[PDB]
Amino acid sequence: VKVFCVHTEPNFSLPWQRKRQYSSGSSGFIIGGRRVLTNAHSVEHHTQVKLKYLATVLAIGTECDIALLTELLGLQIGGPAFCVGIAFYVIPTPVIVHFIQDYEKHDKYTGFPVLGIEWQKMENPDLRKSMGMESHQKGVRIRRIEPTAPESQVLKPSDIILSFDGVNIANDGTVPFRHGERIGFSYLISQKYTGDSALVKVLRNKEILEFNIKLAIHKRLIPAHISGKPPSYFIVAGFVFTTVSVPYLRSEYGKEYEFDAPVKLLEKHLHAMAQSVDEQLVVVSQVLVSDINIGYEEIVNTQVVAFNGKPVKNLKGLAGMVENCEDEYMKFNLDYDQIVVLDTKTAKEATLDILTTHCIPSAMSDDLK
Amino acid sequence: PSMDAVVKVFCVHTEPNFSLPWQRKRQYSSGSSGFIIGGRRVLTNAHSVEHHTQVKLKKRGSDTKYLATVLAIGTECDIALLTVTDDEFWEGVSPVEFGDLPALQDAVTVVGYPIGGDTISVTSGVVSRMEILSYVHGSTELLGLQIDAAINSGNSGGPAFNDKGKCVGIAFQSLKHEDAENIGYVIPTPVIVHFIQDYEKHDKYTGFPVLGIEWQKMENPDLRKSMGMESHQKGVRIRRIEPTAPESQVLKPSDIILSFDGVNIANDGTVPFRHGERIGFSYLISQKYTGDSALVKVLRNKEILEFNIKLAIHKRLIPAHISGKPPSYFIVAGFVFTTVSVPYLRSEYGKEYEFDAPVKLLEKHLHAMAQSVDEQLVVVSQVLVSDINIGYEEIVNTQVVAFNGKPVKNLKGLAGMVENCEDEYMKFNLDYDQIVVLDTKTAKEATLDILTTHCIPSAMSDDLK
Amino acid sequence: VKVFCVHTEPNFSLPWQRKRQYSSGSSGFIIGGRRVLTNAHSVEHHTQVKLKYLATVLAIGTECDIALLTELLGLQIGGPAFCVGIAFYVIPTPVIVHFIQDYEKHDKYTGFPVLGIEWQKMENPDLRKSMGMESHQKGVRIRRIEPTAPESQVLKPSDIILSFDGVNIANDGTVPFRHGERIGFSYLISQKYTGDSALVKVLRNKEILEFNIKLAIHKRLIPAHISGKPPSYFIVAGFVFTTVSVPYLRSEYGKEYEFDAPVKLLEKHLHAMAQSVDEQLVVVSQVLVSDINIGYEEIVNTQVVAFNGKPVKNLKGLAGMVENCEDEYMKFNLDYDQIVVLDTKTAKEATLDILTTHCIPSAMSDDLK
Amino acid sequence: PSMDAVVKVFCVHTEPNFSLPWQRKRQYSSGSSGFIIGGRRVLTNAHSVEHHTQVKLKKRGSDTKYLATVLAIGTECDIALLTVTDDEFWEGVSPVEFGDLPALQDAVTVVGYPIGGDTISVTSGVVSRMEILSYVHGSTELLGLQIDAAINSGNSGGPAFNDKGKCVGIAFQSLKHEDAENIGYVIPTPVIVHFIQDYEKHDKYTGFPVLGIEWQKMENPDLRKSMGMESHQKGVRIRRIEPTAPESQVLKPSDIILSFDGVNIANDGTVPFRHGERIGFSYLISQKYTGDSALVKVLRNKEILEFNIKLAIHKRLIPAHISGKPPSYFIVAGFVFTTVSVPYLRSEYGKEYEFDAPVKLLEKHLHAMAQSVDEQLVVVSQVLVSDINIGYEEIVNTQVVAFNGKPVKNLKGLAGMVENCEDEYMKFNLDYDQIVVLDTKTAKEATLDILTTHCIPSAMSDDLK
Amino acid sequence: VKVFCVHTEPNFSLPWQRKRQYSSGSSGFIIGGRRVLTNAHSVEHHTQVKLKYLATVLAIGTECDIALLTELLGLQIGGPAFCVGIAFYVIPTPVIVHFIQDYEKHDKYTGFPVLGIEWQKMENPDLRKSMGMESHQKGVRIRRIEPTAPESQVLKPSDIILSFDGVNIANDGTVPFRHGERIGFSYLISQKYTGDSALVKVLRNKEILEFNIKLAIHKRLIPAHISGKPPSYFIVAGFVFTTVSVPYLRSEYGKEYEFDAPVKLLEKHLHAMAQSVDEQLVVVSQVLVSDINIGYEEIVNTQVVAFNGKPVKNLKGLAGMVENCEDEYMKFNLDYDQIVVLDTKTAKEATLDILTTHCIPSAMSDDLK
């Protein structure tokens, strides 16, 4: 089919804005049961959809780039296929069938689960022996575990993962796939559905334990996307506070953001884990220049670590602290050992005129109400 | 020598989005040139500081950037007048001193800064010609010096000096010349004097007056004979007069303008200027102040008449600029109504707008006169897609001519007619003989969700509330 | 077949001239009944024709670009085809058969009829209801009607056209074509022959009326072409008066004329309709410089609106008024509120020498005799 | 200083079409340079105003364009002499004053205008060499100054000044040099003086005389011995003499020209010119006026003879130009007969015509002398296709040699022979041993419809009627 | 086959020289009767030939570019073919078979005969009637006839050639070839063998005559080539006299010689005919600079028309006159009305040293002995 869509995208650099309305085209195809598959991006931020007419958007599978009208299996070779998958590369039918069945049994898209662990190979014999692995044993060593995953409890660093649902994991983290072909074990995991259980066999202090672990979706400190939700922001005295996500980084620094973005932010993009369920990377995005913030106008994309001596955990938390602040001064500890000091009464009184100058509807996005 | 007074101008801008009039664009900083003159004052280009939210100034030998104040903006003459509260900025610099209008082929030195650089740059050349030109396209034409030197971004706004170290005006980058043509302009001292003296008297910029007329040459002998001109008489015929300049009252079409403030005007519209030099008669007008009066001698029905006429600024149907104000807009049921101005057209169709914009709009931009002080060209800018407007989604930049039988004069009128609509249906008469029809009740109800979808703060700009 | 032709083209910028003789080549093919089809442009302004020899020109179908030795149906894919049409794109056989049958029954080319109306879609439900359209009714609203068409009588602005010869017209102005394909209703109209009748069903003030309307060819204010006829001109005192057509515009301003031509003329090219059968856009084409016209030499392509207080309707009309003018002065009201004034006796006496200087055979083209 | 007198020349042209001699091309305007001299007079290039129908002049500091008058045109020397009736044009300008012939390597300044521009341009260089050259290709060679400076379109026609502010002539863009070679020419003051003095005496341009001879160097000693030259004698041998210059009477082939007006000519055809400088002897001839006489000393049969000879202008079989006149043409039955000139060849074959034109024509262009004052090269230019001329349609640019047995001398003769043809058949003897045969009665009858088809006003140019 | 040849070419600009030895490669093929065909140029100026070895050169067919180990028929499409001819373009088998049979019956190559006439079409009816051609008669009018051809007798200018060996010649000089294809009549002529007779039917003064004419090879004033013979030259006092041929022109002025060569020479190349069997175009090629010829050194490629009052007919003739000259002076009339005068005794005495300086073996080529 020929897909015709009207899009209204958020501006991540100016989160109170929507980009100009525009239209696009792509392909897709009819599947049994009165449903149509197409790309997820071929309908992202939709306001109206047509096919060749008037269509309906049931679910968006962002991670798998499918729409029904993060590392998954793909084939390197619209609007597919010949059916052997979805044209992205070709997104294969084990991913497609997963998407449909996920929705068809849950009435919503619930993504693809991950184990929430980083791992290291056990190819060195001295490494293996020092951890009590007999010669017949294969697997991978847990480097670190996501604090926001359920398995953060039952699994431990330096556990050696031997198998998943009775499937043997090799020293290079691979499992058998077909005759003469192997695949990373995460494939097995991404084939499960969110909330499914799975048996993980590990070696801990030279002893075998098997855990029954409920699988969940990955919480990332700097989110790959925000599921078509609007980006959040908080403003006071012209200081624009927002949270770092990949779309923000892409909008701020372009296609080469993994090289051009500030190193402090890149480190957290590549290496940091959320220590808590609602932890976000809060930055001063920019400063909307005005008398009240004179001498501060060159602060750009810098993390806020604390407000009036108190740690900042997320955007909602920061916004709360600022509204409840009764102290004479507001003190923001920023990264690079910088501080921002503002007189509390005057800073709050300055916000409105700045909003008017930049046509911002209110001091914060609706999600911070 | 005089290089200590040539400053670097740093400006933060917050520009309106003319295509999306509810938005302001992202803050950005630009750099240009400027210079210190007498009385704690700094001159630079108006365009360098358009839509400013902060201006800073930096001297050549010091890192310190100083917070500045914008005293006045002369958009038509492209001059901004600045000052600085901090005294350390002013101490130690000898202020630029102005010289007389240079002769043709006189040597001129333009001092300023390159683009993205904080070191002094020196450009040289001669005065090519006197000219009457617009410093903003579509705006009032003023006296100007064309120079042999190449003026670019960054160094425009800097002083131009004669061989005596006197400043003969402000550098201006040509709007109509590419950089490889080595053509530049200097906003001359009498225009600068005009702008400053205007400020010093009125505590504000009051613009440059025009005679609101179009004229035709009288170089044909029979044409002159047929209208009763005696053989020693010369001048121009009035083609048309702006309804919004009266003026319109006293003067009439086909009058033959013989002279202006006693100065004899030739059949080609020239007047003597200096020894061996002739220029357009509008220079006699643009040098006056708004509110001033001028003696106009015309021939009407083979008879001489003299009129004393109060001169005003030009009112254009499609404005060359809107004085830094926010662009007006009104929204009902996803229909975005706005007015046509030059910034709008440029934003909609790019720099080539005078060739790419719809012909209906070009016609009115190139040829139409305002029939009243309040007249605006109102269009549907675009349609924000929703159920209420199914089937209209393709309407773009089309003039709204009438609402429920009543002619639309301007945006406030239209917004007013829509608020007070009691009829079952809203019926918009659009250009190309099109009609848009919306059920009044549901159309008004649909507006909120649409505003929300596109993050539009208000259904209308504050000027319409 | 291989077509060999000798051409003598008019100069539209200098209408008293013919361009230099030149020869061309194209393709075509034999059809039954001793006839050959080829392109119309592959024989335009012919003075001699040969095939592979000596051929004869029976009729030229300009609009359909066919010769027998304006929006019609075409196929985007000489001297055709394989037969599925005529190579232009491919001009299909419903157009070809029309051309042949038009001539074969009328002994001349009579073009393709149009309804002579501009129309607007009725896709909006509020628009439909306000005009009394029941939910099952489809069609298009008449925006404006050509004053020089016969149907300018019986049809009215804001009439909603529901059907043509019993064929239902949709809200987007389309009619069924084949299975899964639709086409603009004008297709049905262009399939008719000039002078044919057709039944047009309309909705007027919430009531259905059916009109039997004789179809005619489109009269355009600025003609797409002039059917191989010579361009007209009138001259006095070096002022060259002519009428605006597309070939004139193309000759004056080049291939990009719809952008480069003066805006006043473009507006009339795109948007004006003839208010009368013999209305032409008369302009001063140029001024042939000489004493009598001094001070006037920069007037180029500017409309003449009136002569001595009297409206100019066409070139013949202007020429008449100038010859009959007994007044002391000739006064031309031009566009841009310009006037041209000439002493009548001297201006007429000046014409001949100017003609001699530019080698112009007479003051006017033969059609103005 | 002297820049006030350097004017901009605006010219409207109506050029004949040499390929279609019944047509004039569209009007167009070109701009060039010129300068005011003494006595309400203006000099510029002849080519800048060729085929003029109106000329206007504009001073540097004034918008006003003034209607000018063309007094005289010296095509061979590329000079046009202009004046202006309007006194306002003349008032206030110091007229250019001429200096002497510059020495080699002397500094020269060329003042003029760029192409498509109205500002003063200043070009600098030195005098490279004295030269004898044609200012129109194929035309009489005159004295000229080659300069180091680059002269282009637009600024050619402007004055060239020495270091004393004196004008040393008129700028001339090289016909034989590309612009990147930085080579230009100056039409020197003695040639300008010649042209002006010629006008002042005869109330018209009378051209530049030539000795209608071709010559061969006498640098070989045996050749000199065999013809009786004593050892102190030097000069050139006459190869051939123009039948249309008598001259032809008095001089004879193989005469040895020893001197001209008393000036000793060397074996290479040079004569002394100034200290350490030698130039071609034609400079002694071209500086005379038409009608003037010159003493020619030759050696004939080992004996000295002196001849006083009246000098005339050069008559070329294929003219370098036809003095702005309309080209002649004659039409019968679609056969277009015209005459061959340089403009014809250039129009027919482009700028490379001396390599692309048919060899038969090149031969006569490069080598043939007119056998009589009335002789023209007559050709069939082309055949306008019609039934009467089936089978001849390919004939192009082919000389007509005879009509019904009688030799064709020129176009008027041919047109005459065709009008008075009483024979049943018209029989044209063409080049390449071709014949064209037409039935006299039907051929004449067919002419009208053909003229009508191609919008040809008359079967012949007015000069043949 | 793979042809391997060693070549020693003459220098036409320096006719006493041979270019440096070089080797080449081409293709060819074996034909019945112990013979091999190849290109003629693929063995021109041979000194040794090899095939894939040691071959023999029986005959060179220059005009037809064939070798056995001027306008002929060819096909536009080595070392051929597939056999449909010879790869040159493809030189067809009617030309090939001609070449072989010419040699096989004459033991030498005797070229292809021509009629030795220039002709004009008789397509115009008035032209035809004025010469007494009845409506059924077709043919071409003789413009001019080669003085050095046998038919220069029996045929006359303005004769209308009607047929050749009973084959009808059309008004455009064509004859039938195959169904729907015609060819120039010279094709029929070039198919004959040198010395063959042929019947030429002509119309002369409205009467039909048929001539039996022996066919011969074309003598050209400026020869297309010289059949692998060495170029001739005569020298005296440094004046190098030679004859103009195409190879000379090509060597003097390059590939564009028909544009770059002097016009006087081009005229004779394109338009002159030999008035006599042994007429050659004699030029001063160049002057080898030395005292005796001072003042003459810029004479290049200029025709000698006369020696001491006597017309120059050819190179041998000029050489004779100079050796027999007893007069005090030698006087050469050159083109452009130039003369060259030399003292006879001193000029002859000067020749030898000049020859030594330029390493020229003698004053003249061996053919002038």
From Swiss-Prot, chains A, C, E:
It is found in: Nucleus. The keyword Nucleus applies. Induction: Induced by trans-zeatin (at protein level). GO terms for biological process: proteolysis. One of its GO terms (molecular function) is serine-type endopeptidase activity. GO terms for cellular component: nucleolus; nucleus. Its EC number is 3.4.21.-. The active site is at residues 41, 65. The keyword Hydrolase applies. Keywords: Hydrolase, Nucleus, Protease, Serine protease. Expressed in roots, cotyledons, rosette leaves, cauline leaves, stems, flowers and siliques. Disulfide bonds: none annotated. Homooctamer formed by 4 homodimers. Interacts with ARR4. Belongs to the peptidase S1C family. Serine protease that degrades the two-component response regulator ARR4. Regulates ARR4 stability by targeting ARR4 in the nucleus for degradation. Acts upstream of ARR4 and regulates the activity of ARR4 in cytokinin and light-signaling pathways. ARR4 mediates the cross-talk between light and cytokinin signaling through modulation of the activity of phytochrome B. This is Protease Do-like 9. It comes from Arabidopsis thaliana.
